[PDB]
RNA sequence: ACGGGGCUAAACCAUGCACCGAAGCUGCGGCAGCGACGCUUAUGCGUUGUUGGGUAGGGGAGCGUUCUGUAAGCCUGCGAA
RNA sequence: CCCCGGCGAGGGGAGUGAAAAAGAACCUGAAACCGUGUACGUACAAGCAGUGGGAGCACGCUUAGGCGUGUGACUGCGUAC
Ligand SMILES: NCCC[C@H](N)C(=O)O
Ligand SMILES: [K+]
Ligand SMILES: [K+]
Ligand SMILES: [K+]
Ligand SMILES: [K+]
Ligand SMILES: [K+]
Ligand SMILES: [Mg+2]
Ligand SMILES: [Mg+2]
Ligand SMILES: [Mg+2]
Ligand SMILES: [Mg+2]
Ligand SMILES: [Mg+2]
Ligand SMILES: [Mg+2]
Ligand SMILES: [Mg+2]
Ligand SMILES: [Mg+2]
Ligand SMILES: [Mg+2]
Ligand SMILES: [Mg+2]
Ligand SMILES: [Mg+2]
Ligand SMILES: [Mg+2]
Ligand SMILES: [Mg+2]
Ligand SMILES: [Mg+2]
Ligand SMILES: [Mg+2]
Ligand SMILES: [Mg+2]
Ligand SMILES: [Mg+2]
Ligand SMILES: [Mg+2]
Ligand SMILES: [Mg+2]
Ligand SMILES: [Mg+2]
Ligand SMILES: [Mg+2]
Ligand SMILES: [Mg+2]
Ligand SMILES: [Mg+2]
C-alpha cells in the first residue's frame with residue numbers, strides 16, 4: 001500500500017498561496033515565505049480585533065471633547081453632567097450627534113450644565 | 118452604521134491671524150498645534166488634515182520666562198564629523214526670529230507625511246505686516 | 260487581421276534580443292525596417308528576418324497591403340538552454356548556459 | 370427624525386425605513402418587535418432627551434432576516450514553543466426594518 | 473576519495489579548493505588563536 | 507446483515523499512537539521522548 | 555543624565571472632586587468541558603452551578619490519502635481521473 | 636503544393652486527422668522562474684512590508700441607494716521562521 005503525495009501536498013500549498021495574494025515579492029509566490037506571512041497576518045488580525053475597540057472609543061472621545069468645548073464645557077465635566085442627569089447615551093452616539101445634529105448636541109450640553117449647577 | 122470620517126476633498130479650512138507680542142513661547146505653540154491639526158473641530162479625523170491656516174505676526178517679540186533668553190540652547194548637526202552647532206535663544210531672535218516659533222510648533226506636530234502637511238499651513242512673520250489680505254484672515258485673539 | 264512570424268530556438272539570450280525589440284514596438288513597418296538596418300547589433304539581424312517574414316506572410320496568406328502594416332505585438336521568450344562544461348583552475352568545473360530565445364512579431368493593419 | 374435605542378448591549382441611531390443589523394433575537398421572520406426603552410427622539414430640533422428613557426417613546430420594527438456573518442479566522446501562534454491552533458467563527462445577526470418612531 | 477561524483481567526475485580529492493587550511497595560500501599566522 | 511452493515515463493539519478498536527506527525531497530534535517533533543540524553547536516542551535506554 | 559517639544563508650572567508638598575486608561579469586571583450573542591437536579595431518558599434532551607493561557611508530557615475525539623471486501627453494484631464520451 | 640529565408644535554421648498558409656495548442660524538442664502539461672497587454676498606485680520619502688481604519692480612481696451590477704471586484708494616498712499598532 002504505497003501512497004504518493006502529489007495531489008494532497010499541492011492542494012495544501014495552493015490553499016496557503018491563495019491567502020497570500022497581494023503580498024510583496026516572495027510573500028505571494030514562494031510557499032516557505034507565504035506560509036510564514038499568512039500566520040503573521042493571523043496574529044495581527046486577532047490582536048487588532050481588540051485594538052479596533054480601543055481606537056474607535058479614542059476617536060469618539062476626541063470628537064465629543066471638540067464639540068463640547070464649542071459650547072463652553074470640557075469632556076470630563078460633560079460626562080459627569082450626563083451621569084448626574086441620568087442620561088445613558090454612549091460615546092458612539094454622542095460623537096455621531098456632534099457631527100450630524102449640532103443643535104441636539106447643544107441640548108445635551110445644557111442638560112449636563114444644569115445637573116452640575 | 119459606520120463612524121463618520123472627514124473626506125479631504127470637502128474639508129472646510131479657515132484663515133486666522135495671531136499676534137505673538139508678549140506671548141509665552143510654549144503656551145502659544147500648543148494652541149497653534151491644536152488648530153493646525155484640527156483638534157478643535159467635531160469633524161476631526163486622525164488621518165485627514167482638517168485644520169486651519171494661521172498667520173503669526175511679530176515673531177521676534179515672543180516671550181520666555183526665567184533665564185531662558187540666554188540659557189535655552191538650540192542644537193543641530195551638519196552631517197560632517199565634529200559638526201555640532203549651537204545657538205542661544207537671543208542669537209536665534211537676532212538672526213532669524215521666525216525659526217523660534219517654527220521649531221517649537223514642529224516638535225508638537227505628528228511626525229510623518231501628514232504632520233509635514235499640517236506644518237505648511239503655518240505662516241510666520243517677524244513684523245506686523247503680512248501680504249495675505251486676499252485670504253481675509255480673521256483675528257484670533259488667543 | 261493580425262499575422263504572426265516566429266523564430267524559435269534563436270541562438271541568443273532573451274535579454275539581448277529584447278533591447279532591439281523595444282525599438283520597433285508600435286511602429287509602421289516601413290519605419291521599423293530602417294531602424295533595424297542601422298542598429299549595430301547581432302539581434303537586429305535576427306529581428307529583421309522575422310519582421311521581413313511576417314510582412315511576406317501578410318501579403319501572400321492574408322492579401323494585405325504593405326503601407327498599412329504596423330508592429331502590433333513583439334515579444335521575446337526564453338528557449339531551452341544548452342549545458343556546457345568549462346574548466347577552471349585547480350580542477351574546478353563550471354557549467355556554461357548557452358541561452359536561446361523565441362522571437363515573435365505580429366503585424367496588423369488594424 | 371431619528372431615535373436612539375438600545376438592543377443587544379449596544380445602541381443604535383435609526384430612522385424610519387432604515388434597515389438595521391442587530392444581535393440575534395428570538396423572533397420569527399416577518400414578526401414585529403417593539404422597543405420601549407428608547408433614549409432620545411429628535412424631530413426638527415424638538416429634542417426629547419430620555420432620563421434615561423423617553424416617557425412614551427416606542428420604536429416598532431419588522432424582522433426581515435436572520436443569518437450568519439462573514440467568517441473570521443482566529444489564529445494563535447507562539448514562536449519557538451511548538452504551539453499553534455486555529456479556529457473559525459461566524460456571528461449570528463437579525464436584520465430589522467424600522468417601521469415607526471412614535472414619540 | 474570521492475569516487476562517483478556526477479558533477480565533477482574528473483577529480484576525487486577536492487578539499488584543496490574550499491577548505492581554508494588546505495589551500496596553497498593558507499598561512500599559519502591565520503591560526504593565531506593559540 | 508450484509509457485508510457493509512457489520513460493526514465492531516464500541517471501545518474495542520482503539521487507534522495506535524503515530525509519532526512525529528505535526529503539532530496538532532500532540533506527539534510531533536519528539537514523539538514523547540523529551541529533549542536530549544540516552545533515553546531519547548534510537549536504540550537508547552539502560553538494561554534491566 | 556525630562557522620550558521629545560516645550561514648561562516658572564505643565565515642578566514639589568497637602569487636601570478634594572471629575573475624567574482617561576487592559577484581552578481585569580459588567581452587558582448582548584455563540585461554542586465546549588466537568589458537577590448537581592430534572593420535561594424523561596435508552597443515553598439523548600431540559601434547567602442550574604462552575605470551568606476553558608500553556609512547553610516537556612499524559613488523556614480523549616476526529617479529517618484526509620493509497621489498497622481489499624460490499625462491487626458482474628453505482629457514476630461516466632450527453633465527458634471519469 | 637505555395638510563400639519569406641542562405642537550394643539554411645525557423646516560420647506562415649494548404650492538406651491529413653475526432654483533435655496539429657496530438658507535428659515527431661509529440662498524452663495530460665502543475666510550481667519555481669522569464670515576458671507582453673490592461674486597471675490602479677508610485678519620483679519630500681525612512682525600518683520583518685503586514686494588520687486595523689480609510690479617501691480617490693477603474694470596471695461590473697441595480698437603482699428613487701450603495702453593494703461586488705481590483706488598486707491603496709494617508710494614518711494607529713507592529714524587530715521573520
Ligand atoms: N591516479 C590518478 C587518478 C586521477 C583521478 N582523476 C583523481 O582525481 O584522483
Ligand atoms: K513519553
Ligand atoms: K492533446
Ligand atoms: K511546453
Ligand atoms: K506555468
Ligand atoms: K499601515
Ligand atoms: Mg582559468
Ligand atoms: Mg589539471
Ligand atoms: Mg508513531
Ligand atoms: Mg504537548
Ligand atoms: Mg530525558
Ligand atoms: Mg532536538
Ligand atoms: Mg539537558
Ligand atoms: Mg545507530
Ligand atoms: Mg544508543
Ligand atoms: Mg515622558
Ligand atoms: Mg470612567
Ligand atoms: Mg477594553
Ligand atoms: Mg477587557
Ligand atoms: Mg474575561
Ligand atoms: Mg487549554
Ligand atoms: Mg482564562
Ligand atoms: Mg475498492
Ligand atoms: Mg481519485
Ligand atoms: Mg488542419
Ligand atoms: Mg469529435
Ligand atoms: Mg489516448
Ligand atoms: Mg504536451
Ligand atoms: Mg505552460
Ligand SMILES: [Mg+2]
Pocket residue numbers: none
Ligand atoms: Mg509625492
Ligand SMILES: [Mg+2]
Pocket residue numbers: 679
Ligand atoms: Mg523637506
